[PDB]
Design a protein around this nucleic acid. Structure first.
Ligand SMILES: CCCCCCCCCCCCC
Ligand SMILES: CCCCCCCCCCCCC
Lengths: 146, 143
DNA sequence: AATAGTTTGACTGTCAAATTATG
DNA sequence: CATAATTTGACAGTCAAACTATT
C-alpha cells in the first residue's frame, strides 16, 4: 500500500523547509565556525575538481559570476582557497583548496555520508539497488520539467 | 556510490527549487519568494499560529520571522491579530489573497507528486517511501 | 523575573551593470 | 568584439542583541 499523501506532503515539507538550516547548524557547531552552507557548496565544487575556474563554479552552482567572485574573495580571505592565474590564458583563474579547505571539505562529507546511511537504514541490498534506480528516474523527471 | 546517491539527492533538491521558483514567478503573484510561500503554507495549514510557532517550524529566529511577517502583511497576504486572552501573543491568519495562493500552491504540489508516483513501479514506490521516511527522521533527529 | 514579539545594526547572498585585462 | 574575471550598486534574508509590552 502507498503511503498516505498527507504523510508524504508532511515529510517533504519538513525536509525542504529545514534541510539547509540543519546542515548549516552542523557546520556552525564544528571546529570551523566561519563557513556557511552556501560557502560550503563553493568549497565542495573546488575540492571535487582541483583547478576549476570561477566560470565553471558559476555553471555548477547556477549563480552568476559576480556572486562566485564575492564568495571566493571571502573564502580566500578566510584561508580556505587559493586563486592561481593561468599561464596559458592570462584571463583565467584556477582555484584550489588550502589545507584548511581540504579539512572542512572532509567534514562536510561525513555529514553526507551519515545522511545516506540513515536513508538506507533497514533496506536490503536489492532495495538499495531499487532506490538507486528510483533516484535516477526522479532526477530525470525533474530535469525534463525545466 | 554513497557519493553519487548524494549527487542525485542534491540535484533533485536543486531542481525542485528551480521548478518552484519558475512556477511562482510565472504566476499572478509576482511579489512572493519561495521562503514566503513556505511561511504562507505554515499559516494556511494552522490558522492562528503564532510568530514563535512559525519560528520553530521553519527553524529561523523570531526576529527573522517578524520581518518576514511585516513584508507579507504589507503585501496583503497575512493579518496579525492580538490574542484577547494574552496580549503579548499574536495570532496569524491568511487573507483572502493568502488563501488563494496557498490553495494554488497545495494543488501544484499534489499534482506534481501524484504525477511522479504515477510513473514509478510498485517496488520503486515502496522503497522511495522508506527512504523518504528515513531522510525525514535523519533530520528530525538532529533538530 | 519571565515571556512574546519587535526593532536594530551588521553581514551574506544574490543579480545586473559598469569595469579591467586579455584573447 | 568576445571572454574571464572583478567591482560596484541595490536589494532580500538572516542573526544576535537590545528593546518594548504584557503577564
Ligand atoms: C515536489 C516534487 C518533489 C517530490 C518528489 C518526491 C516524491 C517522493 C515520492 C515518494 C513516494 C512514496 C510513496
Ligand atoms: C540536500 C539534499 C537532501 C535533500 C533531498 C530531498 C529530495 C527529496 C527526495 C526524496 C526521496 C528520498 C529517498
Amino acid at each position: 500500500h502507498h503511503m498516505d499523501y498527507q504523510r508524504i506532503n508532511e515529510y517533504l515539507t519538513s525536509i525542504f523547509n529545514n534541510v539547509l538550516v540543519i546542515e548549516e547548524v552542523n557546520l556552525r557547531g564544528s571546529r570551523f565556525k566561519d563557513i556557511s552552507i552556501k560557502e560550503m557548496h563553493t568549497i565542495d565544487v573546488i575540492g571535487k575538481a582541483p583547478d576549476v575556474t570561477p566560470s565553471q563554479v558559476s555553471k555548477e552552482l547556477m549563480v552568476t559570476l559576480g556572486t562566485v567572485t564575492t564568495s571566493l574573495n571571502n573564502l580566500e580571505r578566510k584561508g580556505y582557497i587559493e586563486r592561481v592565474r593561468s599561464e596559458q590564458d592570462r584571463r583565467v583563474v584556477h582555484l584550489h583548496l588550502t589545507k584548511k579547505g581540504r579539512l572542512i571539505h572532509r567534514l562536510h562529507k561525513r555529514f553526507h555520508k551519515a545522511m545516506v546511511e540513515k536513508i538506507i537504514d533497514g533496506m536490503s541490498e536489492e532495495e538499495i539497488a531499487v532506490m538507486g534506480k528510483g533516484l535516477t528516474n526522479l532526477y530525470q523527471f525533474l530535469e525534463d520539467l525545466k
